[PDB]
C-alpha cells in the first residue's frame, strides 16, 4: 500500500512517471512525479482501443477482416504481414490503424471522439496521425477512467463491440488473475511519453484499472513499462 516503495521503483529506473489506480471510482496516485496524473500527453498507441471501438461500432471493419500488407517498408519487421484488427492491436501496428482511421474519416472520427469526450477531444485535420503528434491529448487520470469504463462495458458503444475490443487486450492470465492493457510509446515527440493502460480482473471478478505514464528515452527496453507496472501491482497486493 506504500506509496514510498513505488516511489523508489520510479526513482531507480531514472524516469519520471505516475501510476494511477482506479478501484470502484476510487483514484489513487503512485510513482515519483504525481503531477503527471493531471497533465495532457499524446495518447500514442493507447488510442487504438478507441479507434477499434469506433471502427467496429460503425462497421468500417470487423474482427475477421485481414488487413493486406502491400509491400511498403514498415518500422518493425513484425508489422510486415497481413493481419487482423486484433493482431494489429497486439503488435501496436499503427499502419493497420491508420488505414481504419481513413475509412472512418475526419467527420465521423471527430464526432465520436467528442461524443466520448476523450482527453481534449480534438483531432485537427489529418485523420491518420492526430493521436501520435497532436493535437489529441489526454491525462492519465482520463485514461484510467476510459479504460475502467471499457472493463465494465460502460463506454457509449454497443456491448458486443466493447467485448470484441476487450478480447484484443488480454496480456496475461495467471493464477485466476487476468491483466488487460495497451502499451504506448510516443517516440517522435520530446519528451517521449510511455503508456501502459489497462486493468486487473481478480479471481473474484473485481476490476482494478491502472494507467501507467512515464517519460521515455530511446535507450530503454520496451519491457520497462511492464516491469514498473507489475512490481507495483504486486506491492499494492493487486496481484
Ligand atoms: C505505434 O504508434 C506505437 C504505439 O505508441 C508503437 C511503438 C512502440 S514499440 C511496438 C512496436 N511493435 C511492438 C514490438 O515490440 N514488436 C516488434 C512486435 C512494440 C509501441 C509500444 O509497444 O508501446 N507502440
What's the 3-state SS for 5-45? HHHHHHHHCCCCEEEEEEECCCEEEEECCHHHHHCCECCHH
Residue 74 Cα to chain centre, angstroms? 21
Strand partners, 191: none
Identify the experimental approach. Answer: X-ray
Question: What is the stated resolution of the deposited model, in angstroms?
Answer: 2.4
Which of 222, 227, 229 maximizes ligand 1 atoms within 8 Å of its Cβ, making it the mutation to test the pocket?
Answer: 222
- Residue of the nearest CA to atom 23 in ligand 1? 184
- Write out the DSSP string of 40-75: -B--GGGGHHHHHHHHHHTTS--TTPPBPP-S---S
Task: Mention every residue, 6+ apart, whose C-beta is less than 8 A from residue 231.
Answer: 9
Question: Rounded CA gap, 54 and 186, in Å?
Answer: 22
Question: Rounded CA gap, 66 and 79, in Å?
Answer: 13
**Cβ distance 87 to 196 under 8 Å?**
no
- Residue of the nearest CA to atom 10 in ligand 1? 92
Apex CA 151: angle with CA 90 and CA 57, to 5°?
70
Distance from the alpha carbon of residue 185 to the mean position of ligand 1, in angstroms: 7
C-alpha cell at 36: 503527471
Question: Which domains are present in the chain?
Answer: 1-239 (3.40.710.10)
Amino acid at each position: 500500500g506504500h506509496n514510498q516503495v513505488i516511489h523508489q521503483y520510479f526513482d531507480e529506473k531514472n524516469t519520471s512517471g505516475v501510476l494511477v489506480i482506479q478501484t470502484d471510482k476510487k483514484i489513487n496516485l503512485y510513482g515519483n512525479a504525481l503531477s503527471r496524473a493531471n497533465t495532457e500527453y499524446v495518447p500514442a498507441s493507447t488510442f487504438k482501443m478507441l479507434n477499434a471501438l469506433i471502427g467496429l461500432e460503425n462497421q468500417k471493419t470487423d474482427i475477421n477482416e485481414i488487413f493486406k500488407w502491400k509491400g511498403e517498408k514498415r518500422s518493425f519487421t513484425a508489422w510486415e504481414k497481413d493481419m487482423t484488427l486484433g493482431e494489429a492491436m497486439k503488435l501496436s501496428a499503427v499502419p493497420v490503424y491508420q488505414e481504419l482511421a481513413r475509412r472512418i474519416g475526419l467527420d465521423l472520427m471527430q464526432k465520436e471522439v467528442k461524443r466520448i469526450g476523450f482527453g481534449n477531444a480534438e483531432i485537427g485535420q489529418q485523420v491518420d496521425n492526430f493521436w501520435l503528434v497532436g493535437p489529441l491529448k489526454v491525462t492519465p487520470i482520463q485514461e484510467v477512467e476510459f479504460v475502467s469504463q471499457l472493463a465494465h462495458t460502460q463506454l457509449p458503444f454497443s456491448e458486443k463491440v466493447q467485448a470484441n475490443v476487450k478480447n484484443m487486450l488480454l496480456l496475461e492470465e495467471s493464477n485466476g488473475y487476468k491483466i488487460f492493457g495497451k502499451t504506448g510509446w510516443a517516440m517522435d515527440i520530446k519528451p517521449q511519453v510511455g503508456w501502459l493502460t489497462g486493468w486487473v480482473e481478480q479471481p473474484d471478478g473485481k476490476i482494478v484499472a491502472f494507467a501507467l505514464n512515464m517519460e521515455m528515452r530511446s535507450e530503454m527496453p520496451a519491457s520497462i513499462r511492464n516491469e514498473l507496472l507489475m512490481k507495483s501491482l504486486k506491492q499494492l497486493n493487486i496481484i
